[PDB]
C-alpha cells in the first residue's frame, strides 16, 4: 500500500490512432497517474483529480516519462529486425515503516521478463543478448543511467511522501462491500452458491462459507475492479438442493468494525 | 509470447430491476496487449462504454475494464464480446446477476 | 582481442561422458550469453545449447536435452558443457561462442569423437 | 526450421542471391535472422545481423533482407574470395538459434 509503482508500455507496431507508448502510474492499489505518447502529457486519476497540489508536479511528471518515451522506442532500433515488439516497464519504489525507500526497475520484451536496472551499478543488465542490446544503445544516451537512478532514489520516494502528507485520505479510504448471497439451481438435486461482494476498498477481502455456524469452504473466487477504483468479489460453493438456506457467507474487511455474517436472499 | 484473455462480467452494485447500475466486464491476464471488447444488450453493441487504460498485473500480463451505464430488467440479456489473437473466435461472457 | 578457446576434446565410448571448457578473455565475461555450437565432418552447424549472462537460465536443442549440461563460473572466466549419454551422432567439433546481438566471436573448437 | 539451396554459383563480378525458408515468428513472438559466412577449416564469421545490418568491416558487397517466412543474402559484385560455405541463422531470443542447411557457393571462371 506504502508503494508508488509505474507501469510503463511501449509497442512498436500500435494500431493506428493508439499509442506508441502510455503509462499508468499506482499509489498501492489505486492509479493515480495517466500518461500517453497521443497527448503527451501526464494527468491525475481518480481521487487524485482533487488532491491539492503543488505547482509544476505534472509538469515534472511529464518531464520524466518524456525522457523514457523516447528512451522506449531508442529500444527498438537497438533490437533492430521486424518484431512486433512490447517493451514493459515496472519502475517505483516503497516505503517501509522505517521512512526508507526500496526501489523497483524491472522490464520485459514480449511479455517476458528480461532485463532491470541496478542501483549499485548504475546500469541495465540481463541474461540475454536482447537485454546487452537494449543496456548498451542507453547506455549511448549522455546522462541517461543518470536520471534512471535519480527518478528511482529521489523523485519516487519524494513523490510518494507528498502523496502520503496530502492525499492521505485517499489511500486510507474504507469502502465497506455490499453484500449478496443468492443461489440458484446447478444440477440434480444440487445448487449453486454465490456469495458476491459489491463496490469495496481496499482489495483485501476474504470471503468464507459457514454451514449452520460450521465451517464449509472458501468456495471458488474472483476480484475484480470497477470504474472507480473500488473492488467486486464472488466465491461459489456446490450445495444439497433445499439445504441452501442452512448456509451463510461471512466477509472479513477493513471497511468492516468486525465480521459480517450475509445470509441467503428471500 | 502469447496468453489467453481471462473475462470476468459483472455489476458495479448489487442488481435490482429497474435501478439504475454500471455493468462491467474486466479482461485480463492476455499478451500481447491488442484487444477488442464489445458489452452486447440482447446481442447488440451498447454504443456508449467506456474503459480504463490498459494496464498490466506483475506477471507483465494486461489487463482492462469496460463499463457502461444501464438499468437491469428481468428480460434483458447483457454479455460481453471479447476478441483476441489467442481466441479461434470471438468469446462471449453473458451477465450472470448472481456475481 | 576477445578470445576463446575451447579445451577437452577427445575420443570417447558411447554411452560416457566429456566435458568440454572455454577460457574467455578479453571482455567482461559476466555481461554476456555464452554458447555451443558443433559441426560434424562435412556437415552443418548445429546450434546445442546456451547460458545467460549471470548462468541462471539455460537452453538446449531438442538433439542434446537432457544429456547436456551447460555451466559457468564467472569468477574464473571459464565456459563448461558436460555431455553424458554421448551417442555416435555427438560426434563433432564444438565450438564456444559468445553471444550478442550486432557481433559474433568463436573459439578455434575441439574435435570430439564417439566411437566404440 | 530454416531450410538452404545446397548450392549456388555465379561469374565474377555479378550478383547472386541465397534463400533461406523458415523464418517466420508466431504472433506476439518475433526472430532476428543471421547470416554466417565459413571458409575451409576455419570458425564461421558473422556477415549480416539483425535481417540486414552488417557488423564493422564487412564487404559493402553483402547485404541481406527479412520477409515473412523467408530471408536472403546477396552477394553483388562477386570476387572468388567470396566461394565459401553460408549459412542462415535465426534467433528467436531467450537464448535460442536456429541453423540452415548451409549453401556453397562456387565462383565461376
Known amino acids: 500500500h506504502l508503494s508508488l509503482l509505474y507501469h510503463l508500455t511501449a509497442v512498436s507496431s500500435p494500431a493506428p490512432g493508439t499509442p506508441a507508448f502510455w503509462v499508468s502510474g499506482w499509489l498501492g492499489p489505486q492509479q493515480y497517474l495517466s500518461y500517453n505518447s497521443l497527448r503527451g502529457e501526464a494527468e491525475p486519476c481518480g481521487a487524485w483529480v482533487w488532491e491539492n497540489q503543488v505547482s509544476w508536479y505534472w509538469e515534472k511528471e511529464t518531464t520524466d516519462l518524456r525522457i523514457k518515451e523516447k528512451l522506449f522506442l531508442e529500444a527498438f532500433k537497438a533490437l533492430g529486425g521486424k518484431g512486433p515488439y512490447t517493451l514493459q516497464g515496472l519502475l517505483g519504489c516503497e516505503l517501509g515503516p522505517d521512512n526508507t525507500s526500496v526501489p523497483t526497475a524491472k522490464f520485459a520484451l514480449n511479455g517476458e521478463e528480461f532485463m532491470n536496472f541496478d542501483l549499485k551499478q548504475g546500469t541495465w543488465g540481463g541474461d540475454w543478448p536482447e537485454a546487452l542490446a537494449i543496456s548498451q544503445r542507453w547506455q549511448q544516451q549522455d546522462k541517461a543511467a543518470n536520471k534512471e537512478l535519480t527518478f528511482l532514489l529521489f523523485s519516487c520516494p519524494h513523490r510518494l511522501r507528498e502523496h502520503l502528507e496530502r492525499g492521505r485520505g485517499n489511500l486510507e479510504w474504507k469502502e465497506p462491500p455490499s453484500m449478496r448471497l443468492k443461489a440458484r439451481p446447478s444440477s440434480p438435486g444440487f445448487s449453486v452458491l454465490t456469495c458476491s461482494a459489491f463496490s469495496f476498498y481496499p482489495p483485501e477481502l476474504q470471503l468464507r462459507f459457514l454451514r449452520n455456524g460450521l465451517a464449509a469452504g472458501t468456495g471458488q473466487g474472483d476480484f475484480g475492479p470497477n470504474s472507480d477504483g473500488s473492488f467486486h468479489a464472488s466465491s461459489s460453493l456446490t450445495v444439497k438442493s433445499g439445504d441452501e438456506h442452512h448456509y451463510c457467507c461471512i466477509v472479513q474487511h477493513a471497511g468492516l468494525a468486525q465480521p459480517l455474517r450475509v445470509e441467503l436472499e428471500s | 509470447i502469447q496468453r489467453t484473455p481471462k473475462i470476468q462480467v459483472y455489476s458495479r452494485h448489487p442488481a435490482e430491476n429497474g435501478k439504475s447500475n454500471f455493468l462491467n466486464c474486466y479482461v485480463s491476464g492476455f499478451h500481447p496487449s491488442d484487444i477488442e471488447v464489445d458489452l452486447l444488450k440482447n446481442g447488440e453493441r451498447i454504443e456508449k462504454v467506456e474503459h480504463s487504460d490498459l494496464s498490466f498485473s506483475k506477471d507483465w500480463s494486461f489487463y482492462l475494464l469496460y463499463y457502461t451505464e444501464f438499468t437491469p430488467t428481468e428480460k434483458d440479456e447483457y454479455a460481453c464480446r471479447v476478441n483476441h489473437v489467442t481466441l479461434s473466435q470471438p468469446k462471449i461472457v453473458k451477465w450472470d446477476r448472481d456475481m | 582481442e576477445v578470445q576463446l578457446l575451447e579445451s577437452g576434446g577427445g575420443l570417447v565410448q558411447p554411452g560416457g561422458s566429456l566435458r568440454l571448457s572455454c577460457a574467455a578473455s578479453?571482455?567482461?565475461?559476466?555481461?554476456?550469453?555464452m554458447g555451443w555450437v558443433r559441426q560434424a565432418p562435412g556437415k552443418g552447424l548445429e546450434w546445442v545449447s546456451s547460458i545467460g549472462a549471470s548462468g541462471s537460465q539455460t537452453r538446449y536443442a531438442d538433439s542434446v536435452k537432457g544429456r547436456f549440461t551447460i555451466s559457468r563460473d564467472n569468477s574464473k572466466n571459464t565456459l563448461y558443457l558436460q555431455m553424458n549419454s554421448l551417442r555416435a551422432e555427438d560426434t563433432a567439433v564444438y565450438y564456444c561462442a559468445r553471444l550478442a546481438i550486432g557481433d559474433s566471436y568463436w573459439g578455434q573448437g575441439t574435435m570430439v569423437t564417439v566411437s566404440s | 526450421a530454416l531450410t538452404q539451396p545446397a548450392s549456388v554459383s555465379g561469374s565474377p563480378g555479378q550478383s547472386i542471391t541465397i534463400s533461406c525458408t523458415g523464418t517466420?515468428?508466431?504472433?506476439?513472438?518475433?526472430?532476428?535472422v543471421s547470416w554466417y559466412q565459413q571458409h575451409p577449416g576455419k570458425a564461421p564469421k558473422l556477415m549480416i545481423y539483425?535481417?540486414?545490418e552488417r557488423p564493422s568491416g564487412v564487404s559493402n558487397r553483402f547485404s541481406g533482407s527479412k520477409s515473412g517466412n523467408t530471408a536472403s543474402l546477396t552477394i553483388s559484385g562477386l570476387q572468388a574470395e567470396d566461394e565459401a560455405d553460408y549459412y542462415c541463422?535465426?534467433?528467436?531470443?531467450?537464448?535460442?538459434?536456429?541453423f540452415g542447411t548451409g549453401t556453397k557457393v562456387t565462383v565461376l571462371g
Open positions: 539483425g535481417d540486414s
Open positions: 541463422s535465426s534467433y528467436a531470443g531467450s537464448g535460442i538459434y536456429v
Open positions: 578479453g571482455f567482461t565475461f559476466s555481461t554476456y550469453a
Open positions: 517466420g515468428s508466431d504472433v506476439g513472438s518475433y526472430n532476428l
